[PDB]
Tab-separated table of C-alpha atoms and ligand atoms in Angstrom:
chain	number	residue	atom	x	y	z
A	1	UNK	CA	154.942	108.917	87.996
A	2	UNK	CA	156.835	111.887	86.998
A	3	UNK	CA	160.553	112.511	86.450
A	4	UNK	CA	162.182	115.800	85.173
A	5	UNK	CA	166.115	115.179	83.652
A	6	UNK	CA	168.469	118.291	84.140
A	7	UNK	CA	170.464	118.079	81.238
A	8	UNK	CA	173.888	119.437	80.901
A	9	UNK	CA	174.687	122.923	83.295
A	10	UNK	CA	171.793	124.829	82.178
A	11	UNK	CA	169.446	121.757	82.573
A	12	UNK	CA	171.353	121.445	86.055
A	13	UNK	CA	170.892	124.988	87.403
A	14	UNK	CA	167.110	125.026	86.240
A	15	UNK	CA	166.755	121.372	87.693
A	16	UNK	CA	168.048	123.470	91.214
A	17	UNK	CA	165.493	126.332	90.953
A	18	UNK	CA	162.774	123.455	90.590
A	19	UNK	CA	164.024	122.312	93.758
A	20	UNK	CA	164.793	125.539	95.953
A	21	UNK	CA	161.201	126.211	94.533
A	22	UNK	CA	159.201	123.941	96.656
A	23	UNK	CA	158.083	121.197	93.827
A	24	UNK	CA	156.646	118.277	95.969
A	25	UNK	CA	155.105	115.187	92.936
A	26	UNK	CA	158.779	114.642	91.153
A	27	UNK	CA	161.491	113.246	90.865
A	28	UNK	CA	164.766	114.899	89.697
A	29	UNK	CA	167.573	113.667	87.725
A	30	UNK	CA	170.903	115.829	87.191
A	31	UNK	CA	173.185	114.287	84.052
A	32	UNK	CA	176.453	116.322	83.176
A	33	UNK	CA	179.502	115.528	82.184
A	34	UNK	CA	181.242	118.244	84.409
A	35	UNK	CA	181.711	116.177	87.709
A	36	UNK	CA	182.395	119.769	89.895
A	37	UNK	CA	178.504	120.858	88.546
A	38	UNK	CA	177.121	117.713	89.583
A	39	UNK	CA	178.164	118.443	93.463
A	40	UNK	CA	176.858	121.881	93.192
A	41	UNK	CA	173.223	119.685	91.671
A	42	UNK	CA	170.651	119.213	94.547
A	43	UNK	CA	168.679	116.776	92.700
A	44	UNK	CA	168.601	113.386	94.803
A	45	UNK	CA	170.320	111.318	91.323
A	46	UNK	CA	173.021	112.570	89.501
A	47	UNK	CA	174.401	110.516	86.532
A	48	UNK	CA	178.346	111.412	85.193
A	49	UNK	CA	178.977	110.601	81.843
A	50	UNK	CA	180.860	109.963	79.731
A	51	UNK	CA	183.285	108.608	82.300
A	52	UNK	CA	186.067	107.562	79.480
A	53	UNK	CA	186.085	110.242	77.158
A	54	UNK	CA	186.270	112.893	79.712
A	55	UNK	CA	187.887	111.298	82.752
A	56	UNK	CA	185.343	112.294	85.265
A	57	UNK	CA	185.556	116.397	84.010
A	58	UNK	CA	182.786	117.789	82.223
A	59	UNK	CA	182.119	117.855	78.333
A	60	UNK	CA	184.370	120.835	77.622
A	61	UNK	CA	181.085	122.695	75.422
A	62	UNK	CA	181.305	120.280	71.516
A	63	UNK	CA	177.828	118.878	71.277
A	64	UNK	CA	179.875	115.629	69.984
A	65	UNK	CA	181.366	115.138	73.395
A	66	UNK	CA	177.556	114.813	75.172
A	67	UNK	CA	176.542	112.412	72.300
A	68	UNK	CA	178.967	109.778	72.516
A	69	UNK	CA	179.000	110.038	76.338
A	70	UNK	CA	175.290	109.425	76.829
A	71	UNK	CA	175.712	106.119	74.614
A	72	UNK	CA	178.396	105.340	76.522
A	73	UNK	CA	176.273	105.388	79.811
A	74	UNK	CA	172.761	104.360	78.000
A	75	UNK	CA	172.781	101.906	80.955
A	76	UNK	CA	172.586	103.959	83.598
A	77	UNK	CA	170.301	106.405	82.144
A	78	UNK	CA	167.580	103.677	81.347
A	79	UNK	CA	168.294	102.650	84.733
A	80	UNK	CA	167.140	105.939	86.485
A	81	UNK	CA	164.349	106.665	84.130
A	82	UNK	CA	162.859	102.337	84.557
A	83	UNK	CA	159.390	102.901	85.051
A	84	UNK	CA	158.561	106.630	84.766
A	85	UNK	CA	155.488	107.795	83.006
A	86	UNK	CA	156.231	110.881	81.884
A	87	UNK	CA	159.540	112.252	81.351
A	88	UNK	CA	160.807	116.371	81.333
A	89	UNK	CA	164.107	116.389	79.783
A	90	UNK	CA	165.283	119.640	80.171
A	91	UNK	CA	168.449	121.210	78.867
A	92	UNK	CA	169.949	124.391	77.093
A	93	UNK	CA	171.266	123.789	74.028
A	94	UNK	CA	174.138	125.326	71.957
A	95	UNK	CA	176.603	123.986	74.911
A	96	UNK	CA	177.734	120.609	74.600
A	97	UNK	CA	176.256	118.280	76.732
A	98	UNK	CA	172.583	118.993	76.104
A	99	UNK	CA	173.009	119.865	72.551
A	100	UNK	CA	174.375	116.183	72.127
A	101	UNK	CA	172.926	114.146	75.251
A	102	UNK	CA	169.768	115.420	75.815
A	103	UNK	CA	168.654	114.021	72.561
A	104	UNK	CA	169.489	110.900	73.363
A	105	UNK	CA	168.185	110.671	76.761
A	106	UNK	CA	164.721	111.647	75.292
A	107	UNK	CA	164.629	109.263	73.022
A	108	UNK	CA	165.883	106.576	75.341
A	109	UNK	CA	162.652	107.868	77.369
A	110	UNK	CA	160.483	107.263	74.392
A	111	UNK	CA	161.878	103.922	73.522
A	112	UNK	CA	161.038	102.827	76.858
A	113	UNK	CA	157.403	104.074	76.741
A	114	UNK	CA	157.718	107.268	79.100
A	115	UNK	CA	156.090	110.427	77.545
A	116	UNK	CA	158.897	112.256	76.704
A	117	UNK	CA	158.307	116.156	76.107
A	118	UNK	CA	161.417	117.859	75.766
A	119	UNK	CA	161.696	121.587	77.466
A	120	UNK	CA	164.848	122.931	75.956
A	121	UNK	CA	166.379	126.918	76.056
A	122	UNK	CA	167.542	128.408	72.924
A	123	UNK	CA	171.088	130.298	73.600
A	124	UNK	CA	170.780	134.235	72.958
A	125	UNK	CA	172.192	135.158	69.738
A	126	UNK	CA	174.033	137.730	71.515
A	127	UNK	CA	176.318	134.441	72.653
A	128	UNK	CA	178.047	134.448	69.244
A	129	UNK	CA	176.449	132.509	66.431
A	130	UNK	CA	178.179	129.415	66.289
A	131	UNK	CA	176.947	128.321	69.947
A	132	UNK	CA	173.488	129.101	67.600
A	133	UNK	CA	174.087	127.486	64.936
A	134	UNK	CA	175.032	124.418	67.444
A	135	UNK	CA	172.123	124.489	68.989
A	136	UNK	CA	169.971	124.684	65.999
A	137	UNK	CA	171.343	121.160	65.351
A	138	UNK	CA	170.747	120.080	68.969
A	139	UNK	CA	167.113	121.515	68.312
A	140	UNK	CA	166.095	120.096	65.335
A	141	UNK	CA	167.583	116.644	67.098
A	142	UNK	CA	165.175	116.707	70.212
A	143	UNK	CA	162.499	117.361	67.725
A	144	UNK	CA	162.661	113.736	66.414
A	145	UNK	CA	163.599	112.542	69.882
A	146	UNK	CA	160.753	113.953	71.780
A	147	UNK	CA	156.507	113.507	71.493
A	148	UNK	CA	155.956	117.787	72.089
A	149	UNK	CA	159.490	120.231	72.236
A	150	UNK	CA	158.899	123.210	74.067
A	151	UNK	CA	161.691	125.617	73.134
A	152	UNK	CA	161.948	128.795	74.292
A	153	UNK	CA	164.484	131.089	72.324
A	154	UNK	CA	166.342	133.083	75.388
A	155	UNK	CA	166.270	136.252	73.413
A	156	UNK	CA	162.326	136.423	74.039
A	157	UNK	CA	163.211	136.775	77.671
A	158	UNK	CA	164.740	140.454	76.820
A	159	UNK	CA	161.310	141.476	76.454
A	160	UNK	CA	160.675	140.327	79.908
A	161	UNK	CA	164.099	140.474	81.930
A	162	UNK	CA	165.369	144.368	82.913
A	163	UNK	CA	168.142	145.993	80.228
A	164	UNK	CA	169.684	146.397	83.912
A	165	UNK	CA	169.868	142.553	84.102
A	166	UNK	CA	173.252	141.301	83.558
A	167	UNK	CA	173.967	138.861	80.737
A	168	UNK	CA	175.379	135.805	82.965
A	169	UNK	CA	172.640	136.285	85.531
A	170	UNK	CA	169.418	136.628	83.003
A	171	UNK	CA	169.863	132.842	82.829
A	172	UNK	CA	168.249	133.196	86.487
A	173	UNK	CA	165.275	134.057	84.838
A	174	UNK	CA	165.601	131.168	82.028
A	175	UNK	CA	165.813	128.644	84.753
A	176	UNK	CA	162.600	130.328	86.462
A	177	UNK	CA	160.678	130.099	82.381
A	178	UNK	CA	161.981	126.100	82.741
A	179	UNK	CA	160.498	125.537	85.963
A	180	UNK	CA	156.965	127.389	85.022
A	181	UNK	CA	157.372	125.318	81.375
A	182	UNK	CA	157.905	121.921	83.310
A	183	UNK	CA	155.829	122.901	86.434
A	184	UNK	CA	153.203	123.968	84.485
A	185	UNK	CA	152.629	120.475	83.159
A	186	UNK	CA	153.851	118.493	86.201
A	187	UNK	CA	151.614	120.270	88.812
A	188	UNK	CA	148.512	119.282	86.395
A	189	UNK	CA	149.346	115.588	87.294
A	190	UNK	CA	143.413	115.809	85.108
A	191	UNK	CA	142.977	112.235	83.098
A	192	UNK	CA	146.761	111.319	82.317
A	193	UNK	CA	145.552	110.032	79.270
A	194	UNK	CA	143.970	113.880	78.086
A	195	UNK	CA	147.536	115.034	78.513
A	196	UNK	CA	149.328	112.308	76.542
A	197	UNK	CA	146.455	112.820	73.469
A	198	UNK	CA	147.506	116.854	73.674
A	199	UNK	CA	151.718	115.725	74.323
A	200	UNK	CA	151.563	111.992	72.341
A	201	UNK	CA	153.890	112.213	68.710
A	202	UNK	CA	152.536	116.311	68.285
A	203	UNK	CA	156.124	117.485	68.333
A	204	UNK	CA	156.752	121.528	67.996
A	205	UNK	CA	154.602	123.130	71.398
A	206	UNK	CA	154.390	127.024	71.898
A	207	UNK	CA	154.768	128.071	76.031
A	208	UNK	CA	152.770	131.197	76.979
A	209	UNK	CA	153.585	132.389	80.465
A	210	UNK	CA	151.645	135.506	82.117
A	211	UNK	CA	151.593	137.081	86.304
A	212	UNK	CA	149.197	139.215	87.205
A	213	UNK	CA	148.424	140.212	90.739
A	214	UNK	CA	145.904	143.312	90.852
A	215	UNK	CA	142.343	144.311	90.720
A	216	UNK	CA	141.673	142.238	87.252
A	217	UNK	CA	144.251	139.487	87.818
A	218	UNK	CA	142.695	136.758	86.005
A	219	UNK	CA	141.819	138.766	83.334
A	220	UNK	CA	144.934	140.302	83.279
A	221	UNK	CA	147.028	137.031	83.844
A	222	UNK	CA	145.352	135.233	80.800
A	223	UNK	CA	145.615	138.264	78.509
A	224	UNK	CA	149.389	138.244	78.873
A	225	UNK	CA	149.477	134.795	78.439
A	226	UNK	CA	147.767	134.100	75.358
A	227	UNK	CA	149.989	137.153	74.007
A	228	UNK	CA	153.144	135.749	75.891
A	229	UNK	CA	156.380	137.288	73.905
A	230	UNK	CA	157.714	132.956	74.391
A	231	UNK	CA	155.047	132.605	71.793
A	232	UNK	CA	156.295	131.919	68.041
A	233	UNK	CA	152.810	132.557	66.884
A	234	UNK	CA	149.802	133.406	68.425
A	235	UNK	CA	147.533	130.335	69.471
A	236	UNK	CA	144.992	129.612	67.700
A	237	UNK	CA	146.542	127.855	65.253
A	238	UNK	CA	146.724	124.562	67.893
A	239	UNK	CA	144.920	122.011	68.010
A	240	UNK	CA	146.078	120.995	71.352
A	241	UNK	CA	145.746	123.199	74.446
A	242	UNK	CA	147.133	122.512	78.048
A	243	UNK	CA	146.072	125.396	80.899
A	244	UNK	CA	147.342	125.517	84.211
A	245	UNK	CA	145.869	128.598	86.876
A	246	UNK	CA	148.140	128.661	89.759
A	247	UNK	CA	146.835	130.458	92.548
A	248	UNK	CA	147.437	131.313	96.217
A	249	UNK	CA	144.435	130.406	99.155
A	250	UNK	CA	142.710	133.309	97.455
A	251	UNK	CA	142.061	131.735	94.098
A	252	UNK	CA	138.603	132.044	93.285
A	253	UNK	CA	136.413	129.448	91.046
A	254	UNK	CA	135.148	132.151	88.949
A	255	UNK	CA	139.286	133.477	88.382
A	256	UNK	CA	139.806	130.114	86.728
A	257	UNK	CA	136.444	130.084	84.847
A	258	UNK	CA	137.139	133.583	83.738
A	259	UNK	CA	140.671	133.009	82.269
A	260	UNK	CA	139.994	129.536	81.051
A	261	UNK	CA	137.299	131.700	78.686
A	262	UNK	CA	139.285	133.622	77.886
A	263	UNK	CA	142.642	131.116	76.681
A	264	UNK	CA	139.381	128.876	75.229
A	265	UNK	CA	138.448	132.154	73.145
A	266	UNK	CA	141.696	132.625	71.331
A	267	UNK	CA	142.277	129.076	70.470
A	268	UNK	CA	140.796	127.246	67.803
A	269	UNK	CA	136.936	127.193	67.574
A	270	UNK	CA	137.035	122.990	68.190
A	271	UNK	CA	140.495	122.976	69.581
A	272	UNK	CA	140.935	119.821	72.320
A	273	UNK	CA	141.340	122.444	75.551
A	274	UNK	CA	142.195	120.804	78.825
A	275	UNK	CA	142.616	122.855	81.844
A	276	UNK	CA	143.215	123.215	85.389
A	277	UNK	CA	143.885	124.697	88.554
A	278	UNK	CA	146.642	124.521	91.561
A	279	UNK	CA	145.839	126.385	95.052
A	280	UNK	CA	150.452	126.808	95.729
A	281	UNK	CA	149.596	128.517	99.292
A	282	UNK	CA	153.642	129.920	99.096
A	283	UNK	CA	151.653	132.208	96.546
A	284	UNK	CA	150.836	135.474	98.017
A	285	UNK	CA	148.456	136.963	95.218
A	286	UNK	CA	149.558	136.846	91.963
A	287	UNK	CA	148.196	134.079	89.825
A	288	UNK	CA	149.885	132.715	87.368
A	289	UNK	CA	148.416	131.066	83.608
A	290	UNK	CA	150.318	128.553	81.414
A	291	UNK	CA	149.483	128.127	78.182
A	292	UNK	CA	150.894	125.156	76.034
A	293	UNK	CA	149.815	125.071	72.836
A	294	UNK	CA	150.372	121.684	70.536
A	295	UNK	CA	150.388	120.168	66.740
A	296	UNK	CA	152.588	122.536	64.106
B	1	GDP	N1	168.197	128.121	82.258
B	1	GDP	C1	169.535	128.268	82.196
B	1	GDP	N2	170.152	128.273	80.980
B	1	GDP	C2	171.502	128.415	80.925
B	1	GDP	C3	172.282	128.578	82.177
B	1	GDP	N3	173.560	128.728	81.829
B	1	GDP	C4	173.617	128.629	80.475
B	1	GDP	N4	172.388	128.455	79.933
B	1	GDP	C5	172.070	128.337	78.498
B	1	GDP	O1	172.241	126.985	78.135
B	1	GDP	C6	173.161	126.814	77.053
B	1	GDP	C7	174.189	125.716	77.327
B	1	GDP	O2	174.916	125.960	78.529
B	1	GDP	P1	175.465	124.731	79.413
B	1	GDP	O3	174.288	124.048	80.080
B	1	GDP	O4	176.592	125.237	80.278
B	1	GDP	O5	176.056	123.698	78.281
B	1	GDP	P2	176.418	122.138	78.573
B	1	GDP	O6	177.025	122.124	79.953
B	1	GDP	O7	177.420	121.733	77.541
B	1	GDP	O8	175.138	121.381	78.363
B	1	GDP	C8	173.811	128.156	76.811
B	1	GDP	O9	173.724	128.459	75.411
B	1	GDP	C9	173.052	129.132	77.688
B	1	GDP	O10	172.294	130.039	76.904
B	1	GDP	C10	171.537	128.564	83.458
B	1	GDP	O11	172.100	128.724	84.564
B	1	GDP	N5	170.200	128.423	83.369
């Protein structure tokens, strides 16, 4: 039993690409503060909070807004998570309502047993340095609050995105790194209780992402994966390894073989590696490796 939390606008819109994407085992959960984003939200709950402090608008971007407003609706979060295994909280921080809620919701997931891994965006530090320096807070907060934080600093997606790619619309792109991050995981979902021994109290995770479609694909999927510029450090410095192989009908058994070698190669010699694959028949023929690497 799986739930993903869009946390705060960011949260929201990547919560909405999970959903336009088709993304058939979860259930999604949209908390703002900002009533006019949660009517844009498609996710089936929303949650407003704060409901006194900000009237029923949204958190108008200080992370001290969020916090108090997710206490003040504790309630009604605990209420929509009640019985969910495993919790995504995802959210970007530096804004206001993820930098302050989204902590708390995680560790309102963790106090009531869910695994909580926390898949958070770091702002660009082209968006001025205080919305960093915010966020850096908000960071550092879902690290206590969470069993693994994935965090993936935005700026990494320059080398990825186009320089053509226009600043308020590279976020696209963000959203589309949340979904793979939290997709990754979820479509995995394996014994549940492998994952929570790689996710369980590890804390700081490293995401590698790579697509390949051609000739070598697998080999050429995996290779940008384990060298995926979302990585902090290269690999093999985890103890803890999650794989996922998403294919189309055309996914070969030896594809996965070859690329799980391959991820199993640069990570620890007697690291605990679980892997699998997902035939996604929307896939036409790019395949597409997720590495998540635990225990910093
Ligand atoms: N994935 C994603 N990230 C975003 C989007 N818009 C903004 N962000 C990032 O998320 C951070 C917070 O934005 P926002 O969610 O509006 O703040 P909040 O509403 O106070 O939680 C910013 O620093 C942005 O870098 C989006 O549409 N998608």
């Amino acid at each position: 039993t799986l739930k993903v939390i869009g946390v705060g606008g960011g949260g929201n819109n990547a919560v909405n690409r999970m959903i336009d994407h088709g993304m058939n085992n979860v259930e999604f959960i949209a908390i703002n503060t900002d009533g006019q984003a949660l009517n844009l939200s498609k996710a089936e709950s929303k949650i407003q909070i704060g409901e006194k402090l900000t009237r029923g608008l949204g958190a108008g971007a200080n992370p001290e807004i969020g916090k108090k407003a997710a206490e003040e609706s504790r309630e009604q979060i605990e209420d929509a998570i009640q019985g969910a295994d495993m919790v995504f909280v995802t959210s970007g921080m530096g804004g206001g309502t993820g930098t302050g809620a989204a902590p708390v919701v995680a560790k309102i997931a963790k106090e009531m047993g869910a695994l909580t891994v926390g898949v958070v965006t770091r702002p660009f530090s082209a968006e001025g340095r205080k919305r960093q320096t915010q966020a850096a807070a908000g960071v550092e907060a879902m690290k206590a609050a969470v069993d693994t934080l994935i965090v993936i600093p935005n700026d990494r997606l320059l080398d990825i995105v186009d320089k053509s790619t226009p600043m308020m619309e590279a976020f696209k792109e963000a959203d589309n790194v949340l979904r793979q991050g939290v997709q990754g995981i979820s479509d995995l979902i394996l014994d549940f209780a492998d994952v929570k021994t790689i996710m369980s109290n590890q804390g700081s995770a490293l995401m590698g992402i790579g697509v390949s479609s051609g000739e070598n694909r697998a080999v050429e999927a995996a290779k940008k994966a384990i060298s995926s510029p979302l990585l902090e450090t290269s690999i093999v410095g985890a103890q803890g390894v999650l794989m996922n192989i998403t294919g189309g009908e055309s996914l070969s058994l030896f594809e996965a073989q070859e690329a799980a070698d391959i991820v199993q190669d640069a990570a620890d010699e007697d690291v605990n590696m679980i892997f699998g694959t997902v035939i996604n028949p929307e896939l036409q023929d790019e395949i597409v490796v997720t590495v998540i690497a635990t225990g910093f």
